[PDB]
Amino acid sequence: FINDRGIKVLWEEAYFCPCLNPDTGHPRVDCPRCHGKGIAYLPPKETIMAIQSQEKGTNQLDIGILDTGTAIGTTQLEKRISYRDRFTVPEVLMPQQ
């Protein structure tokens, strides 16, 4: 049922990069593992997943326009997901200007 309704997706787990500065507790601006984000990622894994209520919430602010989208996912059996894990859907394209 999950494979029937879901969409093919790449799944990569998340882990804190070693580049975190031990004293400030904050990361290097640019390293291969993470390009400024304080979190690194593992090699991709392929999976089928179901997604609902894909939403592009946009906030118009003094700093500019910003996208805060929200969505709900339903996964397969025996898979344990972690906070700040990452998914990417190659098939689906999103327009921007």
Binding site: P32, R33, L42, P43
Partner: protein, 144 residues
């Protein structure tokens, strides 16, 4: 002649080299080159690294696990990393499609398989399905 490439034919040899622990280099189509390795220690599992350049005081290779498939190994070209030469400076690499005129001045398409050179750098090519050599000027690249 030049020996820049020493492809491995049998996967059994590849596994044997992997058991020996020597690093491999696996080509990809329209994608970055990759290195492969067998993990040391108690648990034996395949590891990969996107770092191609040689290990150095300023450059350290980064290795991670992966569930590599034999299908990539058996199909794609494989080499010993340390023995690999980065490039062979010729106009048309091997397995490159070109258009050539046959001996009877009739034109046919072909792909290249040869590496020969004098000591000045003048190169010659022998085409798949052909015997004699063809010059850099005679051959014409076939557009995709």
């Amino acid at each position: 002649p030049i020996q820049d490439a020493k492809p491995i034919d049998d996967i059994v040899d590849i596994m044997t080299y992997l058991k020996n622990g020597k690093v491999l280099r696996v080509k990809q189509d329209n994608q970055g080159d990759i290195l492969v390795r067998m993990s040391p220690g108690k648990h034996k599992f395949t590891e990969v690294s996107r770092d191609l350049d040689k290990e150095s005081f300023y450059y350290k290779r980064h290795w991670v696990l992966y569930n590599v498939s034999v299908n990539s190994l058996i199909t794609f070209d494989v080499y010993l990393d340390e023995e690999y030469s980065e490039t062979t400076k010729v106009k048309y690499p091997k397995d490159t499609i070109v258009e050539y005129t046959r001996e009877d001045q009739e034109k046919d398409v072909a792909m290249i398989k040869e590496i020969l050179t004098d000591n000045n750098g003048n190169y010659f090519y022998a085409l798949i399905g052909e015997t004699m050599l063809f010059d850099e000027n005679k051959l014409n690249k076939v557009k995709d």
